[PDB]
Amino acid sequence: GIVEQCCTSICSLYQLENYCN
Amino acid sequence: GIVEQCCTSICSLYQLENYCN
Amino acid sequence: GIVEQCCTSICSLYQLENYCN
Amino acid sequence: GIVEQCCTSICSLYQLENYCN
Amino acid sequence: GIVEQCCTSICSLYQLENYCN
Amino acid sequence: GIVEQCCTSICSLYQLENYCN
Amino acid sequence: FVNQHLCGSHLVEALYLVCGERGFFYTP
Amino acid sequence: FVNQHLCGSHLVEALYLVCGERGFFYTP
Amino acid sequence: FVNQHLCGSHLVEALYLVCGERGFFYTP
Amino acid sequence: VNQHLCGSHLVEALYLVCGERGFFYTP
Amino acid sequence: FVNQHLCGSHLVEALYLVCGERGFFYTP
Amino acid sequence: NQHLCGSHLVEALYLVCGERGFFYTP
Ligand SMILES: [Cl-]
Ligand SMILES: [Cl-]
Ligand SMILES: [Zn+2]
Ligand SMILES: [Zn+2]
């Protein structure tokens, strides 16, 4: 999920965008 | 500057990107 | 929405709880 | 104190309210 | 108080420091 | 840089001020 | 003005905190 | 985990900016 | 002590919301 | 609301500025 | 103006996120 | 850890530097 991908490793905007509605 | 353009109207990610180094 | 209700007047904790899952 | 109680384990808002004056 | 002094005109580092313990 | 100096140990205000342009 | 945008930004911070493990839905 | 907790706060903040009118569904 | 410093920043934010008109005393 | 939002930035500012002293927040 | 000040605070945050490894120049 | 810390750094620099501002490089 978002924690695994973005809290242990840095997420770009592009990566964050995957979790939008 | 960034304040007149983005504090008077909301700036998109694209508009914000112009002020990147 | 939440902006209409909570950006014109401060919303209480109860009012904020409305948008919890 | 609050650092000891709340910076390794998450304190709920209800728990946090204990530190209001 | 701090809201009256600092929410219409910007308070400096020095002015903010006045409200420290 | 600033991450090396201030994300391993806390930097004081004056130390942070070193990175003002 | 960008008041509503600035406000919404603080709103998601408050909802994050109020909602705990439940989380929340965010739609303008 | 408080470090996870701090991170999520920055996540919803970021999603708020990125997703725009799409919004998002935050769920731990 | 960076973790305690980052945590403290989110703690006061949290206290700001929860305490409302009571306010709060913050001390390291 | 604006006053509330301003206060949110003030307490963050005091957290940084006051350091080990800390501060007393009253609305 | 405190409204510009609060807005600017959110701008550097957005730029921090948006600009990434490039980083950015801030000047009022 | 570094990305989160850096976010607070930029907030801190925004306050401390005042009218001078700053240049952010990772
Ligand atoms: Cl953090
Ligand atoms: Cl604001
Ligand atoms: Zn943080
Ligand atoms: Zn704000």
Residue E7's CB is within 10 A of a number of other CB atoms, namely 21
**Whose CA is closest to H11, among D18, J8, G26?**
G26
Is residue J22 classed as helix, strand or coil in its secondary structure?
Answer: coil
Nearest alpha-carbon partner for J7 in I21, I4, E7: E7
Q: In chain K, whose CA is at the least distance from the CA of L23? A: K25
Single-letter amino acid, residue F5: Q
- Identify the closest residue of chain D to I10 by CA–CA distance: D7
Interface check H4 vs I, CB under 8 A: no
Helix (H), strand (E), coil (C) string for chain C: CHHHHHCCCCCCHHHHHCCEC
- The answer to whether the beta carbons of residues L13 and F16 sit under 8 Å apart is yes
G7/B contact by beta carbon, under 8 A: no
Beta strands K24-26 and L22-24, pairing class? antiparallel
DSSP letter string, E1-21: -HHHHHSSSPPPHHHHHTTB-
Residue L24 neighbours by CB under 8 Å, 6+ apart: B21, K12, K15, K16, K19, K23, K24, K25, K26, L10, L13
Other CB atoms within 10 A of residue D11 CB: 18
Contacts of H2 in chain D (CB under 8 A): 6-10
DSSP state, residue G10 = H
The DSSP call for residue C11 is P
Experimental method: X-ray
The percent of chain C in helix, strand and coil, each rounded to the nearest 5, is 50, 5, 50
Q: How far is H1 from chain A (nearest CA, A)?
A: 11
Q: What residues contact F8, with CB distance under 8 A and at least 6 apart?
A: I2
Q: Residue F2 corresponds to which tokens in the numbers above?
A: 């600033």
Non-local CB neighbours of B14 within 8 Å, separated by 6+ positions: none
C-alpha angle J15-E20-I13 in degrees, rounded to nearest 5: 30
Torsion of CA L15, J5, K26, E14, to 10 degrees: -20
Residue K1 sits at the chain L interface (C-beta within 8 Å): no
Extents of the domains making up chain I: 1-28
C16 vs I3: CA distance, rounded Å:
28
Q: How far apart are the first and last CA of chain B?
A: 14
> What number of other Cβ atoms are within 10 A of residue K19's Cβ?
21
Residue E20 and residue J18: Cβ atoms within 8 Å? yes
Residues with Cβ within 5 Å of ion ligand 4? K 6
I8: Cβ contacts below 8 Å, ≥ 6 apart: D3, D7, I28, J15
Taking Cα atoms as reference points, which of H14, H8, H6 lies closest to residue H28? H8
Strand ranges for chain K from DSSP E: 24-26
Residues F19 and L22 sit within 8 Å (Cβ to Cβ): yes
Task: Tell me which residue of J9, D14, G14 sits closest to L14, measured CA to CA.
Answer: J9
How many Cα atoms are found within 13 Å in the side-chain-facing hemisphere of D21? Answer: 14
Please compute Rg for chain C using Cα positions.
8
Measured distance CA(D12)–CA(K3) in Å, rounded: 32
Nearest to I24 among D7, D13, D20 (CB): D20
The answer to whether E19 touches J7, Cβ cutoff 8 Å, is no
Q: Which ligand is nearest to the CA of G3?
A: 2
What Rg, from alpha-carbon coordinates, does chain A have? 8
Q: Do A and F have ≥3 inter-chain CB pairs under 8 A?
A: no
G10/D14 Cα distance (integer angstroms): 20
